[PDB]
Amino acid sequence: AGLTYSQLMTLKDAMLQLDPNAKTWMDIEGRPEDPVEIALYQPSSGCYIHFFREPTDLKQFKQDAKYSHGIDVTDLFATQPGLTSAVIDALPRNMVITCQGSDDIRKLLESQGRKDIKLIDIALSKTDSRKYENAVWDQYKDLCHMHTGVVVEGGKEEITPHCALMDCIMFDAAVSGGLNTSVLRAVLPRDMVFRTSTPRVVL
Ligand SMILES: [Zn+2]
């Protein structure tokens, strides 16, 4: 199980475009023991890691889908199992990672054998952290089309779906005074995030 040797080498060569000394946000969707969306974001350089994973616990996923990320589980079948472990293995040693609520990132990293990675815990309230939520989506929505379901928050209220990548961007904007100017560039090749499939032709 996991990535093949040549895949790991391509991933390692890929991870070199990460600046190991720059500020790096990280966030996930899904529980740290069963994540389905992973994102790292370096605002100063614009480099970001973004990929997806099929969940193990389908029951807990449906709750996360209805209260948080709104991802269709069928859109994750094409992801490669083991990408999350391989990427976490490939993060630079003694890296400093920033997050809004460091508890979940810590469990994920520690359970993957990366206790060397230090975490900066930014503690913004749940409305303070999403101040730039609309502005972030308005500029970067083309970077993730995976949040297709209706997300909701006694009484129900429909909300904007949570995206691990958009969270990293809007959290950094909240502590920096606005959106960054650095164009965003993906660290991971697209062929590594999803297995390409030709859609069925309508005859
Ligand atoms: Zn997303």
Experimental method: X-ray
Q: Which residues are CB-neighbours of 69 under 8 A, at least 6 positions away?
A: 29, 30, 36, 37, 147, 149, 151, 161, 162, 163, 164
At residue 100, φ and ψ (nearest 5 deg) are -95, 100
Is the CB of residue 180 less than 8 Å from the CB of residue 170? no
Distance, CA of 16 to CA of 189 (rounded, Å): 13
- Angle subtended by helix axes 133-140 and 164-176, to nearest 10: 120
Tokens read off for 6: 């040549």
Distance, CA of 129 to CA of 176 (rounded, Å): 12
Q: Is 37 annotated as a binding residue?
A: yes
SS3 for 29? strand
User: Ligand 1 centroid to 198 CA: how many Å?
Assistant: 22
DSSP E strand boundaries for 30-129: 37-41, 47-52, 96-100, 118-122
User: Ligand 1 centroid to 203 CA: how many Å?
Assistant: 32
Q: Which of 31, 51, 32, 56 is nearest to 41 (CA)?
A: 51
**Can you tell me which residue has the tokens 């929505």?**
141
User: Ligand 1 centroid to 200 CA: how many Å?
Assistant: 25
Q: Is 34 annotated as a binding residue?
A: no
Q: Which of 141, 146, 131, 119 is nearest to 176 (CA)?
A: 131
Partners of 181 in beta bridges = none
Exposure of 44 in the CB half-sphere (CA atoms within 13 A): 7
SS3 for 199? coil
Instruction: Report the first-to-last Cα separation within the chain, whole angstroms.
Output: 38
Task: Tell me the Cα Rg of the chain.
Answer: 17
Q: Which of 65, 126, 117 is nearest to 96 (CA)?
A: 117
User: Ligand 1 centroid to 54 CA: how many Å?
Assistant: 14
Q: Which residues are CB-neighbours of 136 under 8 A, at least 6 positions away?
A: 166, 169, 170, 173, 179
